[PDB]
Write an enzyme that holds these catalytic residues in place. Sequence first.
Site, PDB file in Angstrom:
ATOM      1  N   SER A 132       0.839  -1.198   0.000  1.00  0.00           N
ATOM      2  CA  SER A 132       0.000   0.000   0.000  1.00  0.00           C
ATOM      3  C   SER A 132       0.874   1.248   0.000  1.00  0.00           C
ATOM      4  O   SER A 132       1.678   1.422  -0.920  1.00  0.00           O
ATOM      5  CB  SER A 132      -0.949  -0.047   1.197  1.00  0.00           C
ATOM      6  N   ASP A 178      -9.284  -4.051  -6.152  1.00  0.00           N
ATOM      7  CA  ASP A 178      -8.832  -3.058  -5.186  1.00  0.00           C
ATOM      8  C   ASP A 178      -9.664  -1.786  -5.291  1.00  0.00           C
ATOM      9  O   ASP A 178      -9.766  -1.192  -6.369  1.00  0.00           O
ATOM     10  CB  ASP A 178      -7.353  -2.762  -5.451  1.00  0.00           C
ATOM     11  N   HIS A 210      -7.675  -5.086  -1.716  1.00  0.00           N
ATOM     12  CA  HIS A 210      -6.462  -4.395  -1.289  1.00  0.00           C
ATOM     13  C   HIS A 210      -5.712  -5.151  -0.202  1.00  0.00           C
ATOM     14  O   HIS A 210      -4.511  -4.932  -0.025  1.00  0.00           O
ATOM     15  CB  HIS A 210      -6.827  -2.990  -0.779  1.00  0.00           C
TER      16      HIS A 210
END
Length: 261
Positions: A132, A178, A210
């Site tokens: 991330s 995502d 995600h």
Amino acid sequence: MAANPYERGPDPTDSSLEASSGPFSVSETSVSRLSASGFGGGTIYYPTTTSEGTYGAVAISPGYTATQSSIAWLGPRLASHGFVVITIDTNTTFDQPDSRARQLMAALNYLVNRSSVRSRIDSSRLAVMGHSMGGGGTLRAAEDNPSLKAAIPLTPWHTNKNWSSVRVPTLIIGAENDTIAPVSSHAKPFYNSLPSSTPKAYLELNGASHFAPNSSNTTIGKYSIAWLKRFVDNDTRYSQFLCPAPHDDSAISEYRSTCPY
Ligand code: NA
């Protein structure tokens, strides 16, 4: 003896890379937040054995609001194939991607120079990974530190979409579904901007969210291992997984084609 002195472990197979553990038994130690100059501490996973030589080292960053526990499974998974791996905590959980990039490099500096396992590391063979915002930090670390051997951003997030100066072999893993770092606005723009003269790959996880990188994932493990082997160890035994071809078959000495079709 193999021509490549950095080869470690037996010849790889799909089965051995999809397995929960590689050929090396793994030990672990930790570095406190206080002792970690420039980052928030971490857990170091390392092969117990030293008998085949030193290993490359990998620093892994978590993402926004997250801690080591969100990336912990990568430690044993990757270290068991012959790497020293530090899963870091950041100075604060709200650190932005470019801050995480600096902390990844500070963690590698600690491993090479000050850690209790520094003698197991080849300091000329280092890599960065992250999830991330940690994947955004991975891209920035790669851009600013071209001596790195490999970079693996996992479902990366970053406001900068232009990584055209990255000269470090980079594997970007995206998650098809995502909604936090949508691949159409993060991972894919990142991959498309990377120079075609830099070894690179984009792997998209079918149906994934995600948070696919935060739990044991056979696909992430397999291709992350192959990428680090190929570029941190220069280990061309792993090209077969990244660039498969019929000549990987022992019955086929050569295969040429006008693929794709
Ligand atoms: Na062959």
